[PDB]
Amino acid sequence: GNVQTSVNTYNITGDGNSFTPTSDMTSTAAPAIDLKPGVLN
Amino acid sequence: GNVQTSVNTYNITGDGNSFTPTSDMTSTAAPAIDLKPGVLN
Amino acid sequence: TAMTMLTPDISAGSASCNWKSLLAFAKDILPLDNLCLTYPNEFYNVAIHRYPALKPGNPDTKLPDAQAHPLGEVAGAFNAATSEVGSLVGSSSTLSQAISTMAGKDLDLIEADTPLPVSVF
Amino acid sequence: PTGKLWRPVGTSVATIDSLAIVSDRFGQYSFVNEGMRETFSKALFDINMWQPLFQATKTGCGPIVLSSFTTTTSGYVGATAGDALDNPVTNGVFISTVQIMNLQRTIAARMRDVALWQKHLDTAMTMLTPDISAGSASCNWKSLLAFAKDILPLDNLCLTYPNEFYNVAIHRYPALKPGNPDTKLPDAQAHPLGEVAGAFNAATSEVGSLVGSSSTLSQAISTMAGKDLDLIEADTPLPVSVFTPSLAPRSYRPAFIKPEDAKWIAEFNNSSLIRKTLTYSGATYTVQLGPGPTRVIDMNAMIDSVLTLDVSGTILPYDTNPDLSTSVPAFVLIQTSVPIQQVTTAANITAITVVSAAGASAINLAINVRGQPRFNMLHLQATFERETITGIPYIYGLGTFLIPSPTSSSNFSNPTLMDGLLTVTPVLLRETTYKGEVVDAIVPATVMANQTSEEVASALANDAIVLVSNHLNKLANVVGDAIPVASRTDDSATSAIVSRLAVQHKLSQVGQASPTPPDYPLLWRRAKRAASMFVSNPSLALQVGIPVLTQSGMLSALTSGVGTALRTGSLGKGVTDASEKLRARQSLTVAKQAFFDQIGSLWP
Amino acid sequence: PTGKLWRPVGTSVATIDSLAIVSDRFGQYSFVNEGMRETFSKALFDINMWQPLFQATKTGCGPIVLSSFTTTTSGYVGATAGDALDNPVTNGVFISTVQIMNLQRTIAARMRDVALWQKHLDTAMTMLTPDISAGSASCNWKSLLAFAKDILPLDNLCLTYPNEFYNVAIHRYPALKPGNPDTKLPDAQAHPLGEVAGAFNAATSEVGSLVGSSSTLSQAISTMAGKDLDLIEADTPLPVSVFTPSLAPRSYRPAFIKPEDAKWIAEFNNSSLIRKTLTYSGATYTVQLGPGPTRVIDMNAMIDSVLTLDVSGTILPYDTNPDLSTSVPAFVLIQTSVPIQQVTTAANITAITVVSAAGASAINLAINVRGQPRFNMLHLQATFERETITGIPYIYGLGTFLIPSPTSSSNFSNPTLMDGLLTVTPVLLRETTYKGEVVDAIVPATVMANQTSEEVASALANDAIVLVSNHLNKLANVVGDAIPVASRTDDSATSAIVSRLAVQHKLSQVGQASPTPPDYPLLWRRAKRAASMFVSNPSLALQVGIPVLTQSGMLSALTSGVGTALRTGSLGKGVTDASEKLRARQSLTVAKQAFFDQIGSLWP
Amino acid sequence: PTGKLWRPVGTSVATIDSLAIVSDRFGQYSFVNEGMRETFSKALFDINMWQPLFQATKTGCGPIVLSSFTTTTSGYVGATAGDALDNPVTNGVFISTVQIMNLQRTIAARMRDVALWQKHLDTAMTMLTPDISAGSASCNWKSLLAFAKDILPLDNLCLTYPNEFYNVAIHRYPALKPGNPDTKLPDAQAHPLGEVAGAFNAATSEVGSLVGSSSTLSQAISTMAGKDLDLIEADTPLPVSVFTPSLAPRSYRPAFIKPEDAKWIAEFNNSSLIRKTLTYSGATYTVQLGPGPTRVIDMNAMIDSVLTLDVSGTILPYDTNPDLSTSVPAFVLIQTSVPIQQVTTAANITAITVVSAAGASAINLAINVRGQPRFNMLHLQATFERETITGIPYIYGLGTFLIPSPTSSSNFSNPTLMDGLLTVTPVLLRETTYKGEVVDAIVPATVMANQTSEEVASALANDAIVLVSNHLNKLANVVGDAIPVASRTDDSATSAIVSRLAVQHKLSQVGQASPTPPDYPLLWRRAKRAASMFVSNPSLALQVGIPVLTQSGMLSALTSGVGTALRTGSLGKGVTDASEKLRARQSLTVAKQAFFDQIGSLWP
Ligand SMILES: *C(=O)CCCCCCCCCCCCC
Ligand SMILES: *C(=O)CCCCCCCCCCCCC
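Above: the input entities. Below: the structure tokens describing the complete assembly.
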């Protein structure tokens, strides 16, 4: 967790972070991208 | 009690709230609204 | 079920209960199917207007208000058990109530000396 | 427009022939229609996300803009000169072949790069369930971190780049809200790059989950149109192909199946024994057809399959009648002159071929398992073929014993090894079998309430019955799945049936005193268990004597209901019992909050 | 915008009621939003492709431009006057109803046309696997052609139009690269109309196949939200409906199931025999309840099903005790006064109803299979109904024998035909059964590690256990499928569990010398086999005494991990073992190149 | 573009650093790309539809325009400053976080609202199958209505709002055509809001159903790329993970499985008996290894599983040899010095551990079922672990009896309880087993035609064979499903094989008189049953001695054919037998028209 500083806009051990799940926003990237023949073109 | 922010003018977990009954203001909404025939018109 | 679940109504002098505890407490008791757990300060804002017990902390001085301003401002003022005389809302009705009967059944004329249809009873 | 772009090779005037795919040193420019940019953008978007980890580890090469693989050509873009003429596009955005190659191998190379890191980020992320589905629940960050500082095994990648993975993470888990730099506090809202998608997956308390209930429907709709559940009780010849019978090899236990319970299996019900002989491999053996009826697999009405009669664990009493031992058990065909069930004595049996014997007598195949010597699990097995039995009116497959010398001891034995678990496997799907005949088409409606209790369980692997069972079974999972045939909600399924019972019970009341006005509360409930009994055991609808379900209306009715029922579910079908379902989710988040509370104490 | 187009109707300013669906002589113009043109273009595009075969065979009628079915009207387009008012579209592209009819029946008519040819092109194309997945591999064209000139059966359509099919083909198989006319050499690049799609399906060596790995994820995501794998170990009442129990009729073998191993089956454990009588069809028979305990199906705790006790292949010793023969085997209910397991003698048994007898005594149902006469496969069968047993505290279903005359011979026999394979089929899904009681909701978490080894395998078709098993089974295939719980990759699944074991073993160490600092290398590995043992045999998580898996945390934990795990797979999840997977694909292309080499020699 | 919108925080000059997610009091504006508006519009469109029911019941709040949740900001929109710099969008349409919240909870709240009504509309709609699939068929409206006026149960919502539901309905069922107000007659055409979608689902008589045939293909394509059917007979090491083995616990019947038919099970084939002893729980018992060979589960070659040997319904002759009774049956390991199959007498058996005994002797576990006392269904069960047997060259799991006192009576008994149904469940997927060894990778091609008839059915739960069977099984359902391997259509599957047979039979003819020119009509037909026999019983392709199917070419060939075959189906694949399929649909509509005719009379 050693301080970095600019590489990325947020420090991990940074001031006032906060792990806190909300039933409201179910974390998700993009897995189901459609590529099948008919659907991709 | 998770922070909201604007939906309503007050946060519940907000700063310096205060439960404190006073014999002076007996909490009450409006139940006895008169609607009987003669009295409503 | 959440409000009365901590008698927000006393009738002589005051009496507080440090808010943190209170909340962290009902966070328990309240059964998982209420609606005061799904909207805390969406119910709280409705509540503040019905219980002059819950005084919300003012945003720009972060302290209560002494006075409590629930929408039922007057009605709630005139129900408090005023120490001079029991309760105006009570003593008032217990009277109009009796007045109703007195005229109604026909208590007047109770020992009238003359034929009266049984219906009159 | 769509397809490759073309341009007037003959110049100016572009007719349906003065065109030509504008190819060149880069390959052919194919048009990138609006939606197809959504994909390549959605793919690149998911890679750019990992920007902070690409720089940290000096891989990558800057953010991949999809505008680096395309171009701004203009011409007519279609699939063929003729139709491309009706799509004059100006300064459209096309991607040349050689480019369609990089945007491909780039998204592929980068995809590996991230696929790896993305795996480390995960073993650490999910390693503290950042996902609840009712209300919230925090877990003081210090602890959390100081905790994973432990658990995470020394070869992750979340220990070598904490806030190089954290920055990638913040965009995938709206659970981790980074503390704002100039107020040093969270944000209430969480802004992960998947802003919308993640919003529309949360288990919304009004109705289960839109992403769920939506698919469980489109999924069912697929099947309904696909297999051909529609037309499930159609009354007219249908090619077996229409039933896509696959992976279908059912096994039995004959020598038990009554002949009338399944046409493909006749029996030698004759008074005495019918000892015959046959020179097999020099040695002369005697097929028995012993005391009992000896049910044998008939050959006609037997779709050229792969019969594999297994004889194992089954008793082998060579202990008593010594006659039994020494005889090599073997599946043998038996051509009889007079039709079986009319074949009295040996002179009647034309010939007997040992289609597959078992090397080594019955005293090496044994194995003592507490007195009663059993059969060492072995599989005899023919490969019956429709035409190898051409002309031959009577012929039967029999997995008997082949005794090397019949005696008085084997006078009440009857060596039929058919008590074993035989497994026929239709090796030629095109041809089915029904009521004893081989056909190429079924008549669905015919097979309904036409089999008996066991004229079903005794069906022959890939025969109408087994096909008109594999079919109902799909339709049975579409209702079971999508439709709510398992609650007092008088659903579309049990509703289609109720309307039939009414229209039915209503005309049966027409003519005569009509002393009974139709019920309805009783009809709704009767049809509810009818539709329910179906979802339950799809098969039943084939057995004669099943209430409601077996009248010609139903099914033909049911399906076409369930049909339109799926094509309207809405999206919020999940509103069903979305109350207890919700209350159960809050139940879990309350217990998971309890977990975070320990992570929060133990590792302060 | 979307929906039908509306336009102001009647006198007044445009308003929410001024509007009216602009219908007319052509039907109603429905708007053709951007994406919906992608489909009809993608559909027509796939037809135009077959242009060279339409002219050759004089069918068709020119290329189908989607711009022939639409129009350029303008107005407000919504689903209802109210909302259509907020979509003023000018010169949008709408397709009128009567047109939405042709673009339909045209794409349908043409679709048949091509579907046919397209089938001939194929039996010839795939008839030489034009698809490899690692590196390249040619096959000198002359040979190839001169070869198919053979194989292809005389009724194809690739022999009647070679380079009329070839031109269609070149656009579907980037394997066949036509030789350019003015340099008479190939092109290196292959330009098939499916330029992009075909590029994005190639098994990219970096990560298996984007089209694969992508779907295997969205597929799992569907299930995860669908069935309701989430909430899998929720601790609170859940309607059976929430478990979509369908096609669920499990079969057993009672008269073996211990009474305590499954509440729905009590036994008459009494000293002597309990011969009772009953006039059934005139004739008086004696139910036995012989020497042993005779386990009988209890009626209460028996969800109104369709009990069908099959009695076949099972021994039938009418040979010894002649008493047994002559008795028609039959499933019979038995109402007892005092509760069973307290019912001593005949006077205790209230009454006995033959709910389903077998016509013909025990000497026609037999069939000799080597001394030991078996039972000709037959199915007795009641149709128990919740309320037909109202009030009646004690009643049991028993598939006994009904002896026409009890004797000394049958003094140690005990005619319970329950040794047969009974098959109960819940005929009314809404109601489940648990621990012996009938309910309408389960409490998942309760059924975990609460059954015993066999208090599971002895479950009753559609009972909590069988439901809390059908559920885990889905969640078991989502992990088994999507997540890599079968390699040393400490995946998201086995990771969610590890965090529980830590937090768990960590507090059990709190208070007292704490002489053991948590392990982790040992915890990771212990939780890996825990998550693995689950994917393996989903059931286990119900049996008391299973390491890790049965602690309240796990599962509730696992799923919610596996959950978020699927919602982030990326696309290149296939990077897992995409090395040996790749090396195996090159292995195949090397062997397939070997094939083309013979096609290349034999047919020079 | 896509992602959140950014703006030059440093003003004017927007570089790859002077940007910053434009967040604020509303959250972060995320861009709403063209297609993502299609969804939220398609979702809102399906809600607006229910407008007439929202007003009727005073819920709702007016029509939901998607233009109420968005905005018209402008800036650069990407996933990260770097890539967002290449998407300058002006006055794009973004939806702020707090808005992405309402459009969410609104569509959710409204979704509940309608989901409910929409359910009532249905129990009434489908309650008269408004969907036919061939030709038309009316049902005079008066009757219809006056009819449902009955059936519909008193708690619907279609009785409280008839033409408040009717107006919602008219837009979902193009069956109900409302009578036009100013000509008081229908319309011929039906204009339901789903105008197009409903047009493209009708079972078009030319080809089954585009929506069906389309999916049944994309569905198969998913699998083909997913599981990894491609590479199905790859000849090279493949991690077991590549086979996603899940929910895989197979059960047997050892003490029957020949040792050579399955390496994981050796037998003590020794002359006399081998009575050993062992102090178990104080009491001294004698393991027997009786008269017969007593096949025992070998421990090496036994993937640390969960062996659970069930012993029930199996005979228990404590009646004869009294020696048997009193002995607690129990699964026990047996470490032998000299390798088994070479272990002659007691002094040879190193030690014997009772890994799991059954409390209570063999006379409480019994239960008389007609003379022959059986075993009360009970499950003994070890938990074998790879390394608990480290070093130990010889050790075997044996579910024997543990007699408390061997006698002359048990001199021909042999107490192996292995005749029971043992169920091994691999508890650690990563490791597989092949030919007796434990490995981490299979070599597919090796397992083809390498097992024998029963060297397959005797496979050990999660061993190469069982894995190279679970795999073919998927590929078997892709062909069975998508491809027409069940009709005389010489499909792409049976075609890929035919080309192999030719190339094969053609070179075997090279060199020598070549007196036989290849056949082809006979080859096509031989390969048709080969591809067909595969779809039928996928397994076979593992057994030595199967025509065609087991030559190295096929399969590796087949799949790669079936592969490209699915990636071209077109859409109208349903044209296959779309004639009888059509004729069957007309058959149903003729019978359903017959129904409407009664609804039309009974309720006039
Ligand atoms: C410094 O690296 C100390 C360890 C703190 C973080 C290491 C990784 C564990 C936390 C992950 C944060 C990013 C997403 C999980
Ligand atoms: C967050 O919701 C934590 C729980 C705190 C409040 C929940 C409801 C109990 C207190 C009620 C406040 C409004 C009027 C009772």
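Note for the figure: Helices of chain C lie at 19-29, 40-47, 73-77, 88-106.
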